[PDB]
Symmetry: D2
Subunit: 30 residues, 4 copies
């Protein structure tokens, strides 16, 4: 259903954004 | 510190595995 | 179209697996 | 080490950004 899958997709998108910022932190500090 | 880097990379890898599993649950039309 | 989106999801899943393997390679060489 | 892997760090960061953009392009129930 749209709602439940939209909540899943929105979560995945923000988890990817968190990984982006975490990887940037890791690289900058390396 | 190296421990800070390790813990950060550990979480990144956990989060990537979580996204990998979540994307197998996503139904584009439902 | 559904086919456009299914293609996109398949590409994303392949890309996620690649980053998983590369993050592991990074750790193995750390 | 974490100090001799800039090229791989850069690759991972590029690939995470590419996934981010693709995730933002996904459409449900289209």
């Amino acid at each position: 259903s749209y709602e439940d899958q939209n909540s899943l997709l929105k979560m995945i998108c923000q988890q990817v954004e968190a990984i982006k910022k975490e990887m940037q932190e890791l690289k900058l500090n390396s």
